[model samples]
Structure formats: structure tokens, C-alpha cells
Target: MMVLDIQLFRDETGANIIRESQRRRFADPDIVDAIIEADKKWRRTQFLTEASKKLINICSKAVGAKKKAKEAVLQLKQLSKDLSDQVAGLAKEAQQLEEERDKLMLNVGNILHESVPIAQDEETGNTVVRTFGNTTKRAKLNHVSIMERLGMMDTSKAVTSMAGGRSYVLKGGLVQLQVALVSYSLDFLVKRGYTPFYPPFFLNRDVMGEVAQLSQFDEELYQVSGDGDKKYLIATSEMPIAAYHRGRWFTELKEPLKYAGMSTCFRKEALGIFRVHQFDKIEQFVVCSPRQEESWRHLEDMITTSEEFNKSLGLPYRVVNICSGALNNAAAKKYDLEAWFPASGAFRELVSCSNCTDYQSQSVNCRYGPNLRGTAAQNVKEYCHMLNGTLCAITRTMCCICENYQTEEGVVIPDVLRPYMMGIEMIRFEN
Candidate 1:
């Protein structure tokens, strides 16, 4: 109706990111819905709606887990089996609520950074920002096959065994290399102003909701079975790192809170070693003022840290600007570092960096004062901006080394990690 309502939508909720946010604000959700209905923002409305329907179906089917979860919350006033089943049916009720919720939330993705390329897909959309080195092709550069050849595979039937695919264990040299990689990545970010720590490995839905847009990430998570709190395994250290300083006020941002998140990540999506279920990551994050320039600076600095790590390992790579359609709900702008894999003569994503603006901090309610930092009044709250980058993902980073530096001499340890390698120069053995 009013231009001001449209203005409010942009200045505040900015469309689809605020379903839960708006519901918590007003007794009447209708006003916001009407305002949103009047303003259309999604690209290809049909595509987004179709995605929403599919997501909703999956979410509905998982109603049993949600029922079990909210049981604890529902038990406050004990009800009979019939009532409990329906209520826990948090099912029908929850479905309608989520349908209402998803309509607003799912239609829009994150607000894009100005520089983000608007592309249909990676090949069409991804822009190569810069390249560090040229790559040379070679034989047996496939990491999986080479590691097996090195006798690093604990068993030939490792994948065939009951443990399942992507469950292969690497022993001896690969294990040693894994350890060295972790310590090196942790040390790398810690040297560059990040306070390193192992954040809570398990997070409940609320905390996860604060850091990630659940609709997008829910399918990718492994929910803890038979749980009271309904905790889920972390997909990345960024989840807990975002929650680390949850809901705090800063009178002045003397300096952004920089964190080095050291943790093991678990995922249920696409990979067999290439896309493994469990992995290690050294994640870098920042909490700072909403100044676009400052947050972008942190984004750039974090990417530089990842680039340097790859450079030191002597891995040829490029930093690619992630297209708008490819970036997840949390990232306003993103850069993916793709290492050149010699076997394929193609680059593969190894690290990702994103500047999320105030999206996450707004959800988590970590605010800064209206005044006292640069200029302003005395006391008020505004969300801080957040940025996250992979300093290193051990699986892929180590995979790069095994391929980049592999030869008849075996896998050569990079110069930077030589100190951590216990003076052992190579991870090789008799074929």
C-alpha cells in the first residue's frame, strides 16, 4: 500500500529471510504478508515455488523426528495418547505453520553483494577472480587411487565392508598427514589474529537456526537419533562459531571478534572421500560492525589467508566468485578457491569465503550500540556483520597435496608442513 511499507520490507526484513523474525515481532502476521505480497522480489517465481513445494514435502515427511523432538517441550502438561499424537503431530499444525513460513522465507535467497555475478550455474556464472600458479598434468593424480596404492588404505574391503561407502580409513602416512594438516591450518589462522578454539561439536535446532537457514540445510544434516534436545551434528564449524558469541551487545566494536573454528564436520550429501561424511576443517570467522567496507575487508583478509595456505602447499589454484544462484542462504557474497587437480586437468573447490553482511547477527541478535564507536547517540541496537572462510578443509587440502606433489617418490610433504611432518619427507611405499 504505502511506499513506506515497501521501504520497511527492504530496510528491515528484506523479504524471505524473516518469516520467524516477523512472527516474533507482531501479533498480526497479516500486515507483513500483505506488504510482501504487494512487493515481488524473487527471480523466476515458478522455480522458487517448486523448490519450496519439494522442501515442504521432505520437511513434512520428517514430521516424526520433529514429533519426537517437541515431545519434551510438549510434555510440560501431559496429555493423552490421542491428544499427544495430534499435538506432537506438531505434524499437521507444524505443516500449516511451516507452509505459511516457507512461502515468505523460501521465495527469496540472501541479499546479493553488488559484485556477485548473476549466473544460471557455476560454469556459466562463476567468475575466476585470480590465479596463483599454472598446473602441469601427470599420471595417477587421482587422490583416492594413489592413497590406496600407498598402502594408506586400512583395508581393501574398507568401502565394501559394513561401515559403508566413503567410510574408508587411511592409516600410516595419510593419517600422519591428516594430523599435520590440522595443526598447520589451526596454527595458520591463529597467527593471523584469530582466537582458535574447538566449538561445541553438537548443536540444537535453535542454535542451528540462528546460524543457518534451516530449510536449505536441513536435508544435509545428520540429526542425532533418540534425543532429548534433538541435537544435530555440525556440517561446518561456522555453525557453532556463529553461535559462540550469541546475542550480545557491543558498545563499541574496538575490533571485530575474529575466530578460528577447529572442529570435525559431518555431512549427508554428495561424496565418497571426494564427498565424505566426516571431515576436519579450520574455519575463520569475523564479527564486526555493519560497515560494508569493514566486513568486506574481513572477507578479503580471510580469503587471503586461505590463498596463502594453498600457495605455501604449492597447489596451483584460482579464486572464483560464486554466482548469486549458487551461494547458499547465508552468504551475501562468496568466493570458492578451486585447486587444480592434475588428473582431471580441472579445478575443484577446496575453500569457500563469504561476507554475510548483517544476515546472521540479525538472526542471532548480536547487536552493537547506536553510538560510542564512530558517531551517534548513546544506546540502541543494530546487528553486526559476519564473515566466514575455510582456512583449510583437511580432506581436500591433503588430497590436493597427494595429487599436486605426488610422484614415483610418493606424496611429497609441502615445505610449509615439513616441520609438522616429523622430518619425514614423503608418504610413500613399495607398490
Candidate 2:
């Protein structure tokens, strides 16, 4: 079980934490009062249980010494039994109260970074930090229509084949293009000191809960029905990769531990491949020292890498600083890379980058210190900061490519991906 810092629930600091939590719509309005009452009850019961145990120990010693006085010995023996029973009852009560306190703490989210803007809703809360490429050209058709015209995707046949809704088959150049995108993203991150990983696609329930708001979206997960050990198909590579160091303690990070994880992710949401049941993605993750300044520096590096990746594809996009109300529970601060879709005549979110600080590390017990055996090391063990960003969601990046590079004949491939695509500069339908 993850331990919440009880110190955060005290006087002035507690009030500030509660106020910020309310702004993020994290906890119940009366959550502070509820947590305080529960904590008080838990602590009181613990003290009572300890006192009862101490009394029983004292009575046991007295009973052993007073064997000559039969009546006194009998009385002490009875008192010992009564105290033992009391200890058992109080211990049970303490356990119950502790569970309650833990449950209440789960309602609290990561505190928002001081710089995050407060907004009522996601759309209104978003502040576009930067924009790239030409925004003048209007697309003549949507990506689906363009793909259908070019014979790259077959949606109707996919549905007829019992593949269900929000399903489609990519054929010809589109299939090659998907592979090219993943390879390109992997290479890009690998060059930047990120070790590539083909992470597991299934995650156990405990790890899933730590990595995401599982209670809020439990139905959206694909649980493996028949199981001795319960597991669910991961919604993203982030879960398994982030949970990699669960319950692990590192001995100081000389540099951030970077991972470029590539995986096929699943979700039960009823949106098309762009927001579909399953898609391929290359995710960028980092684990570093607990220093907030160092954490933000790595976050900025991730954001800059994402921007450069998009620019390489010649895809127009904008970066938005996600507002506090719009933030996910794990993120202290977040940014979304919204790619401009000319056909939709709007920017659509293509990637999300989050600096989770120590929020996830706390839950997963991922800590770092300078030493393991020394008492100084025990005091120095602190939760590591975690961050994740989308390097490429192949399906969405393909959609962006199709819409931005579409012509009357076919869709042109982005120059960066041409080498990966086997020198195929454009995807044209065979006549």
C-alpha cells in the first residue's frame, strides 16, 4: 500500500493542500475534515492498543511473582486476560481506521505546480505556448476520405469481417508507413541516450492503479478473465515502463534513466483508430533524482524533442500548457502537442508530456539514495521524479501525414520517413 505523508494534513500547509485539491476537483469538499477525523481515530486506537499490551505485560510479570498469594495471583491472571482482549479489539479498530485513512488519501491527487494555470475546462484552460508551420491551407478532405480514395484503408470490409466498430485495416503503403513511423521515433530517442524497450503489454492490477486513475476508468480496461494472477491489457506502454522500478531503491542517478518504450496499447473506448481500441506507440520515459529543478529540466528536454520530431515530419503543430483542472491525477504539470489537421481545420492533440514529480514514484515505492546500509542513507532515501511523453502514436501520426501531404493523386511521404519507407516518396494507388 502507498503511504501518504500525514504531515501534509497539518494546519496551514494542510489548508493550502486542500484548497489546491479543490481547485483540481480531486477530493470531496469535506475531505480534509474526513481525513483529519479518521487519522485522529486511527492514532488514538493505536495508542490504546499499545497501552493495553503494556498493561498485559506488567500483569503477567506480577502474576508470576505473587504465586504465594493465591487470591492476588488469580486477580492478576484475570486482569491479564481482560487486557489481552482489549488489545485485540483496539488493534482491530486501529486497522479499520488505518484503512479508512488510506482510502481517503487516495482521493488526493498530485499537487499542481505553482505555475499551472487554473481553468474551468480543458478546452478553455489550454494556453497554446507555440505554433509551427503554415496554417493557411485548408484541406479538401478528411483523413478517412483521403485514405479511402487512395485505397490505403478499408473500414467497411473491416466491420463486415466481425472486427467491430472503430476498426479498420491498413493496406499497401499505409502499412509500410506505420512501420516507418515507429522505426523513426525509436531511432530518434535512441540517439538521445534513451534505451529502447519492447515492454510487456499486460499489467497487473496493483501496478495499473499506481500508474493511472484505475477507479475512474476501470470499465475502459480489458481484463484477462480467467486468471490466477489478475492482469489487464495495458492502455499504454507508460504503465509497465513506469512500474519497472516498483519497490526498487536506486543508489543515486548520475544522469536521468531514459527509456524509449514501443508497444501496442489497448483501450475499450468507442472512438476510431485515432482514439481506438488498439494502437501502436513509442513512449518516452525518464526517472531522475527528486530535485524539482532537475525534473523540470528533463521535462523541457522531452518537450523540445517532441517538437523537433514533429517539425522533421513537416507537420504543423502547436504546444499547449494544460491547465490544473485539465491535468491528469499523476501529472503536476502537462503539455500537449496538438498537430494541425488541415482537413479538420483545427489542431488535434497528438502527444502528451507530463512531469509527474514524485506522485507515481511514491505509489510504486521507487526511491533513490546515496547509500543502502548507513543510517544516513535510510534518512536520504527519497522518491524519484518520473516523466513521460508520447514520441509517436503511429495511427495519429499517420492521420496527420495523410491530411497534410494529400494531393489529387495520393499522399506524399514526409522526407524524414522516406529512407525508412524504402525510398517511396509518395503513396499512389495502382492503376
Candidate 3:
């Protein structure tokens, strides 16, 4: 964790990238024009001050010692003050404009990559992306229906005690199933060189504001208030993972720095259970140097990690490039691994891996140096690239497992999860 002196030119280049990103995200030509004008005005003021300093030196050596000479210096000082005032005023105005620009960008959805297939909704998503397995599908059952049948959902208790509408109590084996999924995913990732992390569930307003400014997390985030200022529950571990190294330069720890972050993600979900208020998701993040070209090399490992884990559970799934509109702010590219749900007659997303292409690193000031030893030239040589994958979105994965493997009498367990389930093979009516 070495600190590098910031270089003016490189800082400007990074600032320009951010400004351009803001323009595209906001999609307003007028705002971009205003920003350009402000930048130009500021630069012009700067140039004038430099030129005046040179003039002062020339005037100093001139053979003039009278009231006229004194007046010239006073006039120059007054002019310099006016120029400085103009620059300061323009900078203040530009700061306001930038803030508005950021707000607009945060509300807009990401642009889709060219390779993404065009579709109106999930129904229109390419069918070639799905793979299915035939099991004892006695009757098509949604997760809510299956949980109710197994006495895993305590509706009456939840209604009487908790806030009700969007909440449901998961009892009996269901809680264990959820825990098992998290443990399993963590172990799997740990074996693959990923460090496991458990970050704070509630992020401070500043961090939440930063996430909101990125846009993708705005709709998904849930907030809590009344402690003088607002606080927010994280929508996913991805936010904290991306922000972990914020304002820090990692010159020595170059290339990929991977993590398996576990968290109970909360969302407003006015949409209800099939899309709930709260659920557990295990997110995989890799912060690397070298942008897309180097980051693409990790995609294979990411895909393989997700596929092998799902296959181990005997779930039929396939990986597909996510639509461009669905990509997040930090994601230049993304791939989703959707598992087949026979009951729904559609594939549902169980995992996702995105190549962030130095987007997050650039946004957060996370960078690395050219070599192991730190250099005195000032600023890190390069920003690292980042990638995130969903090893398991527990609730949804369990939904697929239940729907695809249920029998007429009970729900049959997937062989791989059996060890975690204490040798239980099926959830019978009596139990």
C-alpha cells in the first residue's frame, strides 16, 4: 500500500475519461458542451496568469523609477486578481454542473455491448443459451409453492410478528440449505485462489452515494434513516468489493487480486418472493491490471468455476453473454450462467461473470506500478482491471434445484449437496 505522488498530466487524462463517461452515461449533449466551455474558460485564465508573470519579470529590469512604474505594478496586480476571481467563480459553477451530471448518469442504464443479442425481455432471450436435465418433474412447482408444501415457510408466524407482506420465515431444513450453499461456494472459491471476505452490511451514505452515482445500484438498494443522516443496506457484496481499495495505490500487488465475498443482499423488491426482499448471494471479484485484453484471460476460469459448481449439483445450465443494457456501470462485458427450471419452462440466472475493464479501478483510484519496486516519477503506471462473477445466488439456485428434481411424493436432493444435508435424500410429506 504505497502512496504515489500525483502527476498533473496523468491526473488530467483520468479526469477526462471520467468526464467522457459521465457525458455518455447522462446522454445529454448540452451538458457535455457546458463542461467543455467551463474547462476552456478555466484553462484560458491559467494561461493569462502565466503570461502576466513573465511580463512582470521584464518590467522589473526596465530603467523606470517613478510614479508611472509604481502604477504599472499596481495595475498588473489588480488584473491578476480579476483573472483569479474569474477562474474561481467558473470552477465553483463547474462543480455544480458536474454534480448534476453525475446524478443524471447514475439514473441511466448501461449501454449494451455489440455482441449482446437484442431482446425485449427474458422471454425473448436466446433459447440457444439454455441446457436442461430430465428428472422426476411430478408437478411444476415454484419456490414459494414448494417451500409451503415442505413446511419450510412459516407464513402465519411471519405475518403476526414481522412486517408481513414482503417477508416470509424460512424454517426447518431450508435455513440449513441456505447456509450449506454459502459454505459450499466459499470453499469452492477458496480452492481457486480467491480470498474470502465479509464486509459491513450497511454502508455509510458517502459510499452509498458513490454506488448510486454509478446508477446500477440505485433501484436495487434499500435505505435506513433517522440517525441524523441516511444509511443504506447494500444490495450486493459487489459494491463493497469494488470500493475496498478505494483511494489506494497498489503498485506492487499488480495483476489479479481475487475475492469471494459473502453477504445477505437486501432489495426493496416491491415485486415480492420469486424476487424477494432479502436473499443470500456469493459474489466473486477479481481486480487485475491490463484492462480488457488481460482481464479476458480470467473469463475462462470464471466460467469454468461457475459451471463446475452447478454441474456438481447436477443442475443443467449454460453460459451466455449478457445483453448490453443489462451490464453494470463497471462492467464493459458480462456473461450469465442460467440454470434450467423445468417448472417455469425457462432458464433462470444462477451466476454472472463480468469483465469490468479497469472501469472500477479507474473510478476508485486503484492502481499498480510498472514493476515491484516503487518509482519516484510520481503516480502509479497503470490502473488494475476488475471482474465479478456470481458463484451462487442461493435462493434462485435452490429454486431451480427444487423445481427440476422433485418427485410425486417429495423433493429429491441433489447428490452433491447431500453431504451437507446430513444424508437426507428427500423431503417427504410427513417431515
Question: Number of the top candidate by lDDT?
Answer: 2
Order the numbered candidates by lDDT, best leading: 2, 1, 3
- The lDDT of each candidate is 0.72, 0.82, 0.65
Better of 2 and 3 by lDDT: 2
lDDT of 2: 0.82
Cα lDDT for residue 98, candidate 1 = 37
Residue 347 local lDDT, model 3: 63
What TM-score would you give candidate 3 relative to the actual structure? 0.77
Model 3 residue runs over 4 Å out of place are 1-84, 100-114, 118-139, 155-161, 213-218, 226-229, 252-255, 270-273, 370-381
Q: What local lDDT score does residue 85 receive in model 2, on the 0 to 100 scale? A: 85
lDDT of 3 by residue, 190-308 (tens): 98899999988887767665434433345667778876767788888987887787776765554478899999988875321456778899988887766346677786688778988
Provide TM-scores for the models.
0.76, 0.88, 0.77
**Model 1 per-residue lDDT tens digits across residues 184-303:** 888887788889979877888778767766553556787885758888789988888878768787767869899889999988774325668788988998989876478888888888
lDDT of 2 by residue, 48-146 (tens): 888888888799888777775654367778999898888888888988988888787776667777778778588787888899998656888778777
Per model, state how many residue pairs clash. 1, 0, 4
Candidate whose TM-score is highest = 2
RMSD of each: 13.2, 3.4, 6.4
Off by over 4 Å in 1: 1-103, 154-156, 270-272, 371-381
Candidate 2 residue 96 Cα shift, in angstroms, is: 3.0
